[PDB]
Amino acid sequence: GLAGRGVIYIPKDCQANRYLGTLNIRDMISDFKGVQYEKWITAGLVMPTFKIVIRLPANAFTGLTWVMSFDAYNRITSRITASADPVYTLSVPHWLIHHKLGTFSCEIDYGELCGHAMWFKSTTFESPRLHFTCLTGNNKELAADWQAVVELYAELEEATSFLGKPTL
Amino acid sequence: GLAGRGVIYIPKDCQANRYLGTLNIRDMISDFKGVQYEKWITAGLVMPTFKIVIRLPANAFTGLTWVMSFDAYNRITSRITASADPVYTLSVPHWLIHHKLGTFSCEIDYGELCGHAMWFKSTTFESPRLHFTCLTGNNKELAADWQAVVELYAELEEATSFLGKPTLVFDPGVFNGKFQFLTCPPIFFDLTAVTALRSAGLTLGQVPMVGTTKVYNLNSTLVSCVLGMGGTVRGRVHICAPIFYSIVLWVVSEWNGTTMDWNELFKYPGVYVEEDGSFEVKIRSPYHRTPARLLADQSQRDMSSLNFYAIAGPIAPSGETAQLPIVVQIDEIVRPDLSLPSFEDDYFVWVDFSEFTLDKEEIEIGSRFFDFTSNTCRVSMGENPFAAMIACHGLHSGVLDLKLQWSLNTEFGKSSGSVTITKLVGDKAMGLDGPSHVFAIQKLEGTTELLVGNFAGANPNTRFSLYSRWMAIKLDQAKSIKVLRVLCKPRPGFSFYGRTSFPV
Amino acid sequence: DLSLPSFEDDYFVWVDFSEFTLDKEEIEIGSRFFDFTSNTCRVSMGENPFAAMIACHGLHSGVLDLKLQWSLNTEFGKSSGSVTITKLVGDKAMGLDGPSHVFAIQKLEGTTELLVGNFAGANPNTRFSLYSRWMAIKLDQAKSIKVLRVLCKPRPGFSFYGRTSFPV
Amino acid sequence: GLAGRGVIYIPKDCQANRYLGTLNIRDMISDFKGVQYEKWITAGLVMPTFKIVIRLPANAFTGLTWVMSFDAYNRITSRITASADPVYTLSVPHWLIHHKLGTFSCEIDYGELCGHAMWFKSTTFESPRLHFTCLTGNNKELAADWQAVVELYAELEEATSFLGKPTL
């Protein structure tokens, strides 16, 4: 079920390479707080399979494409908050979000994309982030500022091991 | 085949609530004149099944939505010709016409929606109209004025009876939970807002208003037959805007205001709406039901509401300015949790007469159930579902059992005279004498039956002159009476024809 | 080894009104079975198992058949007016008209039914505001009445919820 | 699972008729907050079957007996907060807790003992309380003040009706 949520603010003039924001995955779940958050406290460690949903009004008249970057180890954050070069945002696991397709969804198997289980009380190594950036801009500015909603769905259960299976 | 036709003229700037025009159904057929019109003359009476087609260039770049209102009894015409409030246009059988879908078509079974057969030579009760109004306006004006074509298709054959089959038969203990023609007026979202809330009340028995005018309609009347309801609202949402506008809605039910915490919001059981489609939302309440009507000083938001949260959008290209309209239709309460019926199979007040100024008072009833007036005494009319059902149909027919009760103004020992019920067939001047009854005033109560109907088989909700039984109440010592109360209880099978509305 | 039941399936006293000081007296019942008060007449409440059962539950619901009886204070030949039962759905201000009933005072008795309940389905043993049927007894010549007695007899299925107690 | 909890404070000299405290059932669940509390928010209405557990060191050398009174309609609260007469505490559904038996447990079928379903956001009629009182005192005072833990276990699921089945 819904485990956490957050909001990304889109300026009326969303140009290529605009940083839109960063959501902190653990904060989304703890600020929500949360049937899943509460199951997590009891489990201690979780290795979730998240379904991420970005709710987003479909529109074919803008040309907007965004990138969601999964930055589990906080490697690109510092370098994209002023301006997000696609070389950075595309250098970690990521998904293209096309405006024409509207509401977007993907699976993040935290076991694979991340590798280590999450501890209810505090971050272990670094804090896992989702970055939202604009890859291709709108053909002309839109009528007004707007927002998109980011949602995390999961059925959190107790993790049996600290470590995932090796990506490589 | 084609039986009649007409034209609706659309202004280049078609704004919400613009009245576009009224077509008179019988005139469409007679001005055409017409293989069908000619078959009609021979038949005398017809109970058509019409296919109505509105020819209309499909266009996804305007956001225009129109309403065609079937007004068989001419109930809303006078009130929409300057400006058409959706409360009126949606209060009778109606159809949404979306510009993106282009040419529109529907069936009107005149037997059901109307109730009485049409006479080739002249209108019988009132003249059946089709109204065309704009429900949601164009995002920006179009290039030029234009027109749409309305067409009637039918294979007219001779009608065997004057009366259709009754749309509704009076029963207090029966409100199913399925609705027809329950459309909420448009809800609007500004694009200058990053998020927003629009509430729709679920106190469905509440009578809708336009300024100071009450618009009685069948749906609110039906709901008033119940104390309250819970369950799941099944409906449809229509997003009435150009392809280049879009929005994402979180639709959920809340009780007594709304939470201010976005996180709580999404812990409730709602549904997401991105585009035209159906929806099911559980009615949310501490009592699991929301009341059918409001008491004094209460607001519809104090109870259960259907809330529409804009969580992403609406968005549009620059420089659009129009709001994004959402039109909600409610089809039924599924898996309903109903309260008790508000009324039992029992009597209810029709009218109280009091404050008599003359000893001789004679109240003509005839064969009608209706609102009385008097210059010589005070009339207090009862308000209840039955009376509204009468007001919300074109025709009705049945039998009322009456109970009369009265109390004295003067000392009992000094009392004399009677409450006399005159029962004739015909009229006062040439009528035959039926079961007239003299109740000596000391009885202080009496009973009688009233036929609501006539030789044709049904009454309109207006004055009319059709041979029937005829009743009157005669008082000879009225100043001795403090109050005369008349209650009625419809006999099984009391019938209504042609759902419509009644503005006052 | 039980005795006879103390009560039969019969009416019992709910309330006696007497010693009326004003000709106009209007007693609001609404949808409740409860203890009346008045500044303008004397109220004498009945005490019996039914009333205690109402007092010893959190919620109750059902239908009461009512019998009203009265006797005159003034000479019969001089009497006028009525005991009127107002029956609405809603409230006095915006209510729909039900089976209201005008009992000429010379009838000296009348009957009616009272729904004890509301749209939610049950009443607490306190004041509350929940849409329901609504009843009142209207007197226009109360000073002519020596006593107005209201008896009630619960229809089968009168229900109680949540056993509790009631200190006074 | 555990749905809420609270604490009762026992004085070293626990005499007959000492009022020990009142736990508010809905507060226990909302202060805990709570996998069950969060399921409740989603359900709106719950008709729980609670298992109540009072954790309590078994002791055969005191003679202490307490009463837990289920006061769903807040009928005795006002009259027991200074001193709790057993006539009040035993006048609503209640359980005897004997010190010799230690940790105590019972079931409260909220459908029966209460009658109406609970609304996540606020109290409907009155707020359901558990009262803790001393029925028989300690033979002599104990060594020091102490405490007992009260716990609510339930698997909250959505209530289909407002009303239970009638107790009577």
* Chains sharing 3 or more CB pairs under 8 A with chain C: B, D
Method by which the model was determined: X-ray
Q: Reduce the secondary structure of chain C to three states and give it as a string.
A: CCCCCCCCCCCEEEEEEECCCCCCEEEEEECCCCCCCCCCCEEEECCCHHHHHHHCEEEEEEEEEEEEEEEECCCHHHCCCEEEEEEEECCCCCCEECCCEEEEHHHCEEEEEEEECCCCCCEECCCCCCCCEEEEEEECCHHHEEEEEEEEEECCCCEEEEECCCCC
B407 at C interface, C-beta within 8 A: yes
Burial (0-12, 13-18, 19+ Cβ within 10 Å), B344:
middle
Name, in order, each residue with C-beta under 8 angstroms of B309's C-beta and a sequence gap of 6 or more: B195, B196, B197, B249, B250, B251, B252, B265
Q: How far apart are CA B177 and CA B173, in angstroms?
A: 12
Angle at B361 between CA B356 and CA B363, to 5 degrees: 110
> Resolution in A, one decimal?
2.7
Which H/E stretch holds residue A6? strand A2-10
Same domain for B446 and B353: yes
Same domain for B215 and B73: yes
Instruction: Look at residue B439 and give its three-state secondary structure.
Output: strand
The DSSP annotation for D76-113 comes to: SHHHHSS---HHHHTSSSEEEEEGGG-SEEEEEEHHHH
Conformation bin of residue A113: beta by default, left when phi > 0, alpha when psi is -120 to 50: alpha
Q: Where does a domain end: B296, B321, B342?
A: B342
The one-character DSSP state at B205 is T
Going by C-alpha positions, the residue among C63, C82, C105, C109 that lies closest to residue B346 is C63
Q: How far apart are CA D63 and CA B110, in angstroms?
A: 86
The one-character DSSP state at D14 is -
The one-character DSSP state at D163 is B
Name, in order, each residue with C-beta under 8 angstroms of B440's C-beta and a sequence gap of 6 or more: B417, B418
CA C45 from chain center: how many Å? 10
Q: Where does a domain end: B342, B371, B398?
A: B342
Tokens of B80: 């929409």
* Chains sharing 3 or more CB pairs under 8 A with chain B: A, C, D
Going by C-alpha positions, the residue among D6, D110, D122 that lies closest to residue D50 is D110
CA B361 from chain center: how many Å? 35
CATH number at B186 reads 2.60.120.20
Per this entry, what is the length of chain A? 168
Same domain for B369 and B238: no
Query: What is the phi/psi pair of residue B386, to 5°?
Result: -55, -50
The DSSP annotation for B5-42 comes to: EEEEEEPSS--TT-EEEEEEHHHHHHHH--HHHHHHHH
Going by C-alpha positions, the residue among A129, A135, A131, A149 that lies closest to residue A14 is A135
Q: Could you tell me if residue C114 is inside a domain?
A: yes
Question: D42 and B337 in contact by Cβ < 8 A?
Answer: no
Q: Which of A5, A56, A140 sits opposite B317 (nearest CB)?
A: A140
Query: Interhelix angle for D35-43 vs A35-43, to 10°?
Result: 160
Q: How far, CA to CA in Å, does B395 sit from each of B51, B73, B304, B442?
A: 23, 9, 35, 38
Q: What's the sign of the alpha-carbon dihedral B24, B26, B32, B36?
A: positive
Conformation bin of residue D53: beta by default, left when phi > 0, alpha when psi is -120 to 50: beta
Question: D41 and B286 in contact by Cβ < 8 A?
Answer: no
Angle at D139 between CA D134 and CA D142, to 5 degrees: 80
Going by C-alpha positions, the residue among B392, B407, B466, B51 that lies closest to residue B215 is B392
Going by C-alpha positions, the residue among B285, D39, B499 that lies closest to residue A37 is D39
Query: What is the phi/psi pair of residue D60, to 5°?
Result: -95, 5
Q: How far apart are CA B130 and CA B71, in angstroms?
A: 6
Q: How far apart are CA A61 and CA C156, in angstroms?
A: 68
Q: Where are the beta strands (DSSP E) in B283-360?
A: 290-291, 304-315, 324-338, 348-354
Q: How far apart are CA B477 and CA B411, in angstroms?
A: 13
Q: How far apart are CA C128 and CA D108, in angstroms?
A: 27
Which H/E stretch holds residue B254? strand B246-255
Count of domains for chain B? 2
Hey, of D35, D37, D40, which one would you mutate to test binding to chain A, going by the most A CBs within 10 A of its CB? Answer: D35
Tokens of C13: 């006293």
Q: How far, CA to CA in Å, does B469 sit from each of A61, B423, B426, B435?
A: 70, 7, 6, 11
Question: A146 and B313 in contact by Cβ < 8 A?
Answer: yes
Q: How far, CA to CA in Å, does B424 sit from each of B428, B431, B487, C132?
A: 7, 6, 21, 41
Name, in order, each residue with C-beta under 8 angstroms of B78's C-beta and a sequence gap of 6 or more: none
> Which residues in chain C have their CB less than 8 angstroms from residue B390's CB?
none
Same domain for B224 and B134: yes
> Which residues in chain C have their CB less than 8 angstroms from residue D71's CB?
164
Same domain for B265 and B366: no
Asked if B461 and B391 count as a contact pair (C-beta separation under 8 A), the reply is: yes
How many C-beta atoms lie closer than 10 Å to residue B331's C-beta?
15
Angle at B295 between CA B292 and CA B301, to 5 degrees: 70
Closest approach of B382 to chain C, Cα-based (Å): 6
Q: How far, CA to CA in Å, does A45 sit from each of A73, B134, B138, B409?
A: 18, 59, 55, 86
Same domain for B450 and B396: yes
Asked if B341 and B225 count as a contact pair (C-beta separation under 8 A), the reply is: yes
How many C-beta atoms lie closer than 10 Å to residue D90's C-beta?
16
Q: Could you tell me if residue C2 is inside a domain?
A: no
How many C-beta atoms lie closer than 10 Å to residue D100's C-beta?
12
Tokens of B59: 């266009």
Q: Where does a domain end: B302, B325, B342?
A: B342
Q: How far apart are CA C46 and CA B432, in angstroms?
A: 56
Q: Which residue of B has its CA nearest to A31?
A: B263
Going by C-alpha positions, the residue among A1, A148, A124 that lies closest to residue A68 is A148
Q: How far apart are CA C107 and CA C122, in angstroms?
A: 34
Query: What is the phi/psi pair of residue A101, to 5°?
Result: -90, -5
Burial (0-12, 13-18, 19+ Cβ within 10 Å), D40:
buried
The one-character DSSP state at B116 is B
Q: What's the sign of the alpha-carbon dihedral B223, B349, B166, B372?
A: negative
Same domain for B243 and B168: yes
Q: What's the sign of the alpha-carbon dihedral C53, C54, C58, C62?
A: positive
Domain residues for C59?
7-168
Torsion of CA B225, B230, B231, B233, to 10 degrees: 70
Amino acid at the residue B266: F
Same domain for B308 and B417: no
Q: Which residue of B has its CA nearest to C107?
A: B444
> Which residues in chain C have their CB less than 8 angstroms from residue D163's CB?
59, 61, 121-122, 161
Side-chain-facing half-sphere of B216: CA atoms under 13 Å: 19
How many C-beta atoms lie closer than 10 Å to residue C48's C-beta?
13
Q: How far, CA to CA in Å, does B174 sit from each of A102, B217, B224, B342?
A: 45, 18, 11, 10
Q: Could you tell me if residue C60 is inside a domain?
A: yes
Which residues 12-71 on chain A approach chain B with CB closer than 8 angstroms?
Answer: 12, 31-35, 55-62
Amino acid at the residue C34: F
Which H/E stretch holds residue B110? helix B110-113
Question: A143 and B312 in contact by Cβ < 8 A?
Answer: no
Per this entry, what is the length of chain D? 168
Q: How far apart are CA B1 and CA B157, in angstroms?
A: 12
Question: D44 and B284 in contact by Cβ < 8 A?
Answer: yes
Asked if A83 and A19 count as a contact pair (C-beta separation under 8 A), the reply is: yes
Q: How far apart are CA B492 and CA B230, in angstroms?
A: 28
Going by C-alpha positions, the residue among A13, A4, A17 that lies closest to residue A118 is A4
Query: What is the phi/psi pair of residue D161, to 5°?
Result: -135, 155
Tokens of B321: 């300015």
Cis peptide upstream of residue B177 (ω within 30 degrees of 0):
no
Instruction: Look at residue B265 and give its three-state secondary structure.
Output: helix
Asked if A70 and A109 count as a contact pair (C-beta separation under 8 A), the reply is: no
Q: How far apart are CA B369 and CA B452, in angstroms?
A: 7
Question: C161 and D162 in contact by Cβ < 8 A?
Answer: no
> Which residues in chain D have their CB less than 8 angstroms from residue B264's CB?
41
> Which residues in chain D have their CB less than 8 angstroms from residue B255's CB?
121
Instruction: Look at residue B451 and give its three-state secondary structure.
Output: strand
* Chains sharing 3 or more CB pairs under 8 A with chain A: B, D
Q: How far apart are CA C121 and CA D10, in angstroms?
A: 41
Which H/E stretch holds residue A7? strand A2-10
How many C-beta atoms lie closer than 10 Å to residue B143's C-beta?
6
Going by C-alpha positions, the residue among B250, B326, B246 that lies closest to residue A59 is B246
Q: How far apart are CA A138 and CA A150, in angstroms?
A: 21
Q: Could you tell me if residue C1 is inside a domain?
A: no
Give me Rg for the CA atoms of chain B.
26
The DSSP annotation for A129-140 comes to: EEEEEEEE--SS
Q: How far apart are CA B336 and CA B234, in angstroms?
A: 11
Instruction: Look at residue B437 and give its three-state secondary structure.
Output: strand
Query: Interhelix angle for D35-43 vs D25-32, to 10°?
Result: 110
Instruction: Look at residue B372 and give its three-state secondary structure.
Output: coil
